[PDB]
Design a protein around this ligand. Structure first.
Ligand SMILES: [Cl-]
Length: 221
């Protein structure tokens, strides 16, 4: 059942899947390769190409329809059609989505929230996304993107945001607060980051620091 590949992470390039599309004689599997290519075209910053490829799809089975609907929502989010993106996701039953599909659902929600300049909601969505990620690079990328969202937030939001009782969110909020309070004082910043790590030793960012923080820790002027 090749269709089940849609339930998995798609790590190859769009060219990989398009080349496979040209080597497959089964119409059904051709649609699967088009859907895989359409998914990764978004990752490659080729959203219009992705949308056009979806419009070339032939008849689909139910598993393919579910995946198309998810890609549609991601395209809407990339295009800042935020209400439509949320409508498209709201029509999906999360119980029918695989972990990887769930990761993609929450990533789309995180992009919508970022589009709306709601950095806290975007971070919450990425925490939910993270629960479903097992690919090391995807997790690292999510850590870096989460940090970028926090870095972009206004200081009043960082200073007053509630963690809502969520430990992952609380660890993130205290990390960005440490950065914001001490970035003008490099000496104290390294100490502040060490103090954060010893308070949150098993937080996702403590195991795998955002690249921006690793860069600051490694670089001597
Ligand atoms: Cl992807």
């Amino acid at each position: 059942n090749f269709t089940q590949t849609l339930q998995k992470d798609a790590n190859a390039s769009s060219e990989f899947y398009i080349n496979k599309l040209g080597q497959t004689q089964e119409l059904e599997d051709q649609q699967t390769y088009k859907l895989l290519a359409a998914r990764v075209l978004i990752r490659e910053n080729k959203v219009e190409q992705s949308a056009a490829l979806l419009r070339e799809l032939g008849e689909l089975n139910d598993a393919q329809k579910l995946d198309r609907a998810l890609i549609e929502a991601r395209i809407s989010a990339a295009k800042n059609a935020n209400e439509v993106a949320q409508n498209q996701l709201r029509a999906l039953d999360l119980n029918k989505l695989s972990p990887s599909q769930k990761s993609r659902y929450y990533e789309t929600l995180a992009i919508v929230a970022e589009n709306r300049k709601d950095m806290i909601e975007a971070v919450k969505a990425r925490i939910e996304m993270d629960k479903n990620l097992t690919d090391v690079q995807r997790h690292q990328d999510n850590i870096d993107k989460t940090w970028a969202l926090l870095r972009s937030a206004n200081t009043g939001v960082i200073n007053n945001a509630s963690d809502e009782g969520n430990a992952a969110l609380g660890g993130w909020l205290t990390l960005i607060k440490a950065y914001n309070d001490y970035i003008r004082q490099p000496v104290q910043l390294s100490q502040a980051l060490q103090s954060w790590k010893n308070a949150y030793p098993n937080h996702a960012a403590a195991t795998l620091f955002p690249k921006e923080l690793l860069t600051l820790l490694n670089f001597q002027q």
